[PDB]
């Protein structure tokens, strides 16, 4: 009764002398994550997530070796559990981008990150370690129709059906390492020491080999089109066929949220997600 007390044997080993009741537990979908001052401990809730935990550690070790221009959670220990280093710094509010030199600097750092992700996609240690699913967008569309259309109005279903149609048109690219959920909260910064400096990136649960348009769409979602355009132009990705891929994938974000909220039993996320479609 209380995850901390329940796992106290392991925590005394992994964090000797650390009071368990002083820690913190984020409650994930697959994992309970115990937060310590410089590291976290991933405990698999289900026996599905415990079966994949060895795979996940291999992925994190691949990420930790890559040149991304920043930090990633490094596997410190695995045994079942995975201990990861905590990336320092905090998310940057969209507010800070109003200062144009700050915007310039942050855009530049995003470019380095995406470049390194793109470059890493050509590797083999990466390609053979990381998920690389076929037609993930077709499977997604099948899931939306099955699980979400019944929650939707006729106009909603029509609008969503256009969005899923657009997905068929996407090339099934596996060029780059794709974070998969590269929102503002997942990118951490050092602030109050001159202009913001990228510390690192977290929440790699969705990481795969795929299309970087996905990471770009996420940035645009978190910070708006102006800032995304600044990144697109700095990185030389402001072409038409990229823009199309971005827009198509960006339009699945509310539906992705709903689909996961549907499976979660998280009704607030489901309502928020379905706001357009009913």
């Amino acid at each position: 009764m209380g995850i901390l007390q329940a796992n106290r044997v392991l925590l005394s080993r992994l964090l000797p002398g650390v009071e368990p009741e002083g820690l913190t537990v984020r409650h994930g979908q697959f994992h309970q994550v115990v937060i310590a001052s410089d590291r976290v401990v991933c405990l698999p809730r289900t026996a599905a997530a415990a079966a994949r935990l060895p795979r996940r550690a291999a992925v994190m070790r691949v990420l930790a070796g890559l040149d991304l221009g920043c930090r990633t959670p490094r596997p410190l220990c695995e045994g079942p559990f995975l201990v990861l280093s905590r990336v320092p710094g905090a998310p940057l509010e969209a507010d800070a981008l109003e200062d144009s030199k700050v915007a310039e600097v942050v855009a530049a750092q995003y470019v380095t990150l995406l470049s390194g992700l793109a470059s890493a996609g050509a590797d083999e240690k990466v390609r053979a370690a990381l998920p690389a699913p076929q037609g993930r967008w077709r499977q997604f569309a099948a899931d939306v129709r099955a699980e979400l259309f019944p929650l939707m109005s006729d106009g909603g279903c029509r609008q969503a059906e256009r969005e899923l149609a657009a997905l068929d048109s996407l090339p099934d690219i596996t060029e780059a390492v794709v974070h998969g959920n590269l929102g503002a909260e997942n990118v951490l910064w050092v602030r109050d020491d001159g202009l913001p400096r990228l510390s690192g990136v977290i929440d790699w649960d969705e990481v795969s080999i795929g299309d970087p348009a996905e990471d770009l769409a996420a940035i645009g979602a978190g910070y708006g089109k102006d800032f995304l355009d600044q990144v697109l132009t700095l990185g030389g990705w402001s072409d038409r066929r990229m823009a199309t891929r971005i827009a198509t994938i960006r339009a699945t974000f509310a539906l992705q949220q709903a689909l996961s909220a549907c499976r979660d039993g998280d009704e607030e996320e489901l309502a928020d997600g379905l706001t357009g479609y009913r």
Partner: peptide, 6 residues
């Protein structure tokens, strides 16, 4: 999760 993708 949340519009970014969670």
């Amino acid at each position: 999760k949340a519009x970014r993708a969670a």
